[PDB]
């Protein structure tokens, strides 16, 4: 009990320093400039030295028989640590690398070849082509031009990135830098509920087998209906071209709904047309997300949030990171970097990013060292639970995006969700599995892009329109890789997403298909989540899960029950198409 005194001075300094470092990072994303690079470096160095200091000191106070478990947990947390991890050169090299990879990704220009001084950025320009353009010549130009003029310059940086990130993990007693990320799910010392760093992989590969029947039929359907949009460009057997999948990385098949509508004469379930018709501003999207959490039983957003956050693009002169970002700066300051588009895409992303904050606001009741969320997938699942509910045809009617009103409609909606959700399950499995095999030293630099196209064709079912030399770095052309971030969260997320929704649909008293369920004007479901939302790291994710759902592990069963009507339907419609894919088709 004697060291509860120490933790107060830790929390006092940690909150000043954590906020100091976190705000300097916010300044940078909002205003990319040397004003904020050097501030983000310095505040990061000081915050990091404090952590290695305070962990050294916590290790001077061993833990046993402390009854006020608040102290036991804050100590166990300090015990997880960074210890003498890097020399000044290697800290400053990784700083320079990630102050460059994040800059190149967010500022990277692509010159239009017919005028060498005319340029276009990813946000929103090049992604406008990849998302909405239906011109193969043009979609192909945007797709590679990014990976060539930007993705090539990112390779030797990620190359050094891999070297030094992997040395870090071993210094803190890890297997590899992928193991460092995989350790987020570890539950250790608990008798009835535990989880190893390696069990993450066993569970991912195991449950991923139950996706393939649903994904392969979705693949074949998208193939057959892309062929009606890109006539002579797509094989009826092979893998889909990457640049035709709705975005620059082939991640979300959401934008293919425009081309894959199961029942086109139904009133449009994608309400982007209505949101533009009603002249929705960026705030109205978030206002109409704030209201949903209120109907759950949750508080309004803070006045700091509404006058700090950058929810739109700045002027073109002001260079900025625009990927949806939710911040807990500590000390009560909550911010979001949406750079919102008037669309159902960012509409349902608003509920996602706002779900991050509501989770942050909830577990702010716990001490500093517990304010992280149960694990990666939990911090993401909170947002998806809400957007899944906000997106139902019923809920969209009530909002005012659909005018007053079917088996055909239910499929018409359910495909759109599978395009967004299911399309990213194999993309996510592919991405981190590649990164882990690089971190584990299994894929040499001789075979980086080799193994990347290998896995694109075999696992995802997607091909390169032009075979790429090792010069390219295709994974780093994505935000989550370029800006150091983990991706396996999105696989675990989706399985968590439907476990929780099944439990909440009992609390909200649904009596029906999970497909049609939303959480609105239901204190029962809000109280149910909020009981868990406050916990943070106070409980292992294994129990935070079991205290809401009946399961003590990531589980794929309720995911499939959300989509079972679409699966039965896709089996019917794909008798006229090949279902699998050829490992070796190449439009080249």
């Amino acid at each position, epitope marked *: 009990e*004697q060291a509860k*005194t*120490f933790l107060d001075k830790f929390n006092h300094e940690a909150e000043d320093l954590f906020y100091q470092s976190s705000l300097a990072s916010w300044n940078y994303n909002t205003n990319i400039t040397e004003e904020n690079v050097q501030n983000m470096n310095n505040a990061g160095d000081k915050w990091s030295a404090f952590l290695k200091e305070q962990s050294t000191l916590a290790q001077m106070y061993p833990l046993q028989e402390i009854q006020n478990l608040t102290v036991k947990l804050q100590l166990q947390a300090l015990q997880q640590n960074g210890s003498s991890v890097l020399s000044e050169d290697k800290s400053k090299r990784l700083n320079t690398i990630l102050n460059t990879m994040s800059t190149i990704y967010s500022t990277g220009k692509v010159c239009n070849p017919d005028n060498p001084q005319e340029c276009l950025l990813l946000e929103p320009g090049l992604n406008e082509i990849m998302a909405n353009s239906l011109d193969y010549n043009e979609r192909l130009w945007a797709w590679e031009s990014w990976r060539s003029e930007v993705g090539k310059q990112l390779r030797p940086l990620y190359e050094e990135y891999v070297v030094l990130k992997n040395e870090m993990a071993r210094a803190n007693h890890y297997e590899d830098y992928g193991d460092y990320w995989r350790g987020d799910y570890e539950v250790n010392g608990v008798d009835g509920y535990d989880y190893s760093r390696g069990q993450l992989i066993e569970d991912v590969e195991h449950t991923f087998e139950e996706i393939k029947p649903l994904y392969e039929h979705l693949h074949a359907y998208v193939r057959a209906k892309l062929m009606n949009a890109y006539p002579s460009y797509i094989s009826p057997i092979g893998c889909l071209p990457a640049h035709l999948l709705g975005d620059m990385w082939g991640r979300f098949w959401t934008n293919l709904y425009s081309l894959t509508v199961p029942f086109g004469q139904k009133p449009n379930i994608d309400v982007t047309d209505a949101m533009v018709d009603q002249a929705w501003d960026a705030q109205r999207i978030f206002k109409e997300a704030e209201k949903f959490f209120v109907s759950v039983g949750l508080p309004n957003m803070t006045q700091g949030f509404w006058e700090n956050s950058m929810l739109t693009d700045p002027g073109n002169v002001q260079k900025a990171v625009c990927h949806p970002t939710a911040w807990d700066l500590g000390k009560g300051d909550f911010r979001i970097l949406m750079c919102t588009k008037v669309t159902m895409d960012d509409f349902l992303t608003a509920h996602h990013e706002m779900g991050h904050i509501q989770y942050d606001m909830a577990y702010a009741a716990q001490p500093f060292l517990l304010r992280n969320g149960a694990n990666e997938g939990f911090h993401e699942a909170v947002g998806e639970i809400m957007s899944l509910s906000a997106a139902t045809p019923k809920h969209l009617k009530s909002i005012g995006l659909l005018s007053p009103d079917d088996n055909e409609t239910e499929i018409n909606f359910l495909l759109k969700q599978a395009l967004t959700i299911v399309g990213t399950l194999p993309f996510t499995y592919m991405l981190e599995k590649w990164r882990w095999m690089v971190f584990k030293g299994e894929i040499p630099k001789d075979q980086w892009m080799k193994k990347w196209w290998e896995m694109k064709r075999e696992i995802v079912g997607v091909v390169e329109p032009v075979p790429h030399d090792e010069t390219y770095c295709d994974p780093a052309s994505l935000f989550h890789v370029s800006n150091d971030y983990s991706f396996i969260r999105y696989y675990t997320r989706t399985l968590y997403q439907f476990q929780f929704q099944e439990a909440l649909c009992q609390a909200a008293k649904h009596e029906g298909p999970l497909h049609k369920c939303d959480i609105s004007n239901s204190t029962e479901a809000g109280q149910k989540l909020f009981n868990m939302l406050r916990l943070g790291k106070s409980e292992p994710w294994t129990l935070a899960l079991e205290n809401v759902v009946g399961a003590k592990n990531m589980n794929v069963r309720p995911l499939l029950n959300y989509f079972e009507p679409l699966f039965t339907w896709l089996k019917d419609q794909n008798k006229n198409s090949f279902v699998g894919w050829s490992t070796d088709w190449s439009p080249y």
Partner: antibody
Framework: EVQLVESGGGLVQPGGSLRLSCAAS????????MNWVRQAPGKGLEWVGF?????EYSTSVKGRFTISRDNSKNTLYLQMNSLRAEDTAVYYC???????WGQGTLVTVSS | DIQMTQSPSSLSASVGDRVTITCRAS?????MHWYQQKPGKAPKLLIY???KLASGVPSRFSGSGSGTDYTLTISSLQPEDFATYYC?????????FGQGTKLEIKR
């Protein structure tokens, strides 16, 4: 400077009462433990009590003494409700932590 | 409760000699804390934590210890080191001192 200044009464009748006090400066008051010690002229040092804001006493004095803080005046108090001639000693205030001493005040209890 | 007692309950020593005072605790092996009390004045902390000199204490002083046996030593005893020396627990719910050691200087 780190400074503890002590004051209080001297001679008090047995069975009576007396309150001691110490002021502190040069540092944050509430960041430290405040303690009273006690040295009868012919004895070593005793612990009298402790205040975090928990309050604990040695067995000899808990039934007779009370320790109090005013953390805005930056002061420590010792109130001796029932005094024995046994309690005659020089009383010191001290700053302890996860040291500095004021100079002791002689409380003498005899009739 | 926890108690302790010093082995030389009293000690006479000559100027400039290599001297040692020893305290034996009852039940524990913890970071021990030493004090030097000049008579008629408040006790002054000598060794903040075993083998760490308190601020203001000169290089002549040194502390050490392990087990229940913690010691204090002076390289070259100066005439100005006349005092009674005490040890403080810092370890458990009942704070305590032990039998003090008085040092007298030979001449």
């Amino acid at each position: 400077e780190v400074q503890l200044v002590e004051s209080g009464g001297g001679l008090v009748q047995p069975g009576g009462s007396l309150r001691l006090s110490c002021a502190a400066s040069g540092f944050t008051f509430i960041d430290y433990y405040m303690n009273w010690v006690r040295q009868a002229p012919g004895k070593g040092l005793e612990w009298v009590g402790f205040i975090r804001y928990t309050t604990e006493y040695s067995t000899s004095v808990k039934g007779r003494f009370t320790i109090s803080r005013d953390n805005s005046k930056n002061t420590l108090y010792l109130q001796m409700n029932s005094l024995r001639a046994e309690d005659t000693a020089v009383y010191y205030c001290a700053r302890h932590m996860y040291d500095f001493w004021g100079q002791g005040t002689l409380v003498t209890v005899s009739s | 409760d926890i108690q302790m007692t010093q082995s030389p309950s009293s000690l006479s020593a000559s100027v400039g000699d290599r001297v040692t005072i020893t305290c034996r605790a009852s039940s524990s092996v913890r970071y021990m804390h030493w004090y030097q009390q000049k008579p008629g004045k408040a006790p002054k902390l000598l060794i903040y934590d075993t083998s760490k000199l308190a601020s203001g204490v000169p290089s002549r002083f040194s502390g050490s210890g392990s087990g229940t046996d913690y010691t204090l030593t002076i390289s070259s005893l100066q005439p100005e080191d006349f005092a009674t020396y005490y040890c403080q627990q810092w370890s458990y719910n009942p704070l305590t001192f032990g039998q003090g050691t008085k040092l007298e200087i030979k001449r």
